[PDB]
Structure 1
Amino acid sequence: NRETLDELESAPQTTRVRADLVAIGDRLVFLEALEKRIYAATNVPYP
């Protein structure tokens, strides 16, 4: 019977974060290369 309720609750708290956003076609997407960020000194390989 057309169930539209779903859930919307807290409009959560947000923060301004330095990211990298590129527009490819009609979409906005994040360019993430995480090596220096996380894998850097850890000796775990970058997948």
Structure 2
Amino acid sequence: NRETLDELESAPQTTRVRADLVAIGDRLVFLEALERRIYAATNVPYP
């Protein structure tokens, strides 16, 4: 038929966060280098 019956959410919490934004052409992508953030002293190699 025509289904289109995927439900929407409840407009969740929108916080401000220092992340890193660039734009490549039409698309707008993060940049993430996760060494000093999540892997600093953890002694597990970067994947």
Gaps of 5+ in 2: none
Aligned length: 47
Q: TM-score, normalised by structure 2?
A: 0.90
Deviates more, 1:5-14 or 1:27-36: 5-14
| % identical aligned pairs | 98
Q: Displacement of 1:9 after TM fit?
A: 2.5
What is the TM-score of this pair, normalised by structure 1? 0.90
Distance 1:3 1:19 in 2: 37
Q: Runs of 5+ in structure 1 lacking a partner? A: none
- RMSD after superposition: 0.8
Q: Any runs of at least 4 consecutive aligned residues in structure 1 with deviations exceeding 3 A, and if so which?
A: none
